[PDB]
Structure 1
Amino acid sequence: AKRTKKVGITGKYGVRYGSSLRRQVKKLEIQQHARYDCSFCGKKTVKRGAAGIWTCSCCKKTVAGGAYTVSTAAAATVRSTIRRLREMVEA
């Protein structure tokens, strides 16, 4: 069944710490505990080891990423900016 209406993963904190704080913690904890697609082997086996370390169980490759996500929006922006400047430099 649907065991919780809205607390989701943060049902472990029960009643304490405040609804808004538990809401933020929910948003980041689902991210940090989800599995991510490995861009190398192409199968969803990328898990977080620690904040910033994202290991793949099958291809045995660790990626450096965000604290709670495999890649952050700022990282993607940096990649695009670096690519644009590099391509401009080459030609």
Structure 2
Amino acid sequence: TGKYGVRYGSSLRRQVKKLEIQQHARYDCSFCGKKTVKRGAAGIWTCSCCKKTVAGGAYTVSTAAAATVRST
């Protein structure tokens, strides 16, 4: 959206910041919590604090994969 600029028209350029926002801010970790946990690497949501691994599948903390096998 910042990087995007004038490229695209109404449906795309305006609306992608509304996808970026929920991918942004620094959240709690699954096992600690200072301000660290965002999109660290691409799809890999990291932790700079106590360094701790998450397990979901693709996006954030849980996708379709962990909703099946780490559930049943």
2:57 and 2:64 in contact (8 A); partners too: no
**Between structures 1 and 2, the one with greater strand share:** 1
Matched length: 72
Matched residues, percent identical?
100
Unmatched 5+ stretches in structure 1: 1-9, 82-91
Greater Rg over alpha carbons, structure:
1
2:37 and 2:48 in contact (8 A); partners too: yes
TM-score (norm. length: structure 2)? 0.61
2:27 and 2:33 in contact (8 A); partners too: no
TM-score (norm. length: structure 1)? 0.52
Tell me which stretches of 4 or more aligned residues in structure 1 moved more than 6 Å.
73-81
Query: Aligned-pair RMSD on alpha carbons?
Result: 2.9
**Between structures 1 and 2, the one with greater helix share:** 1
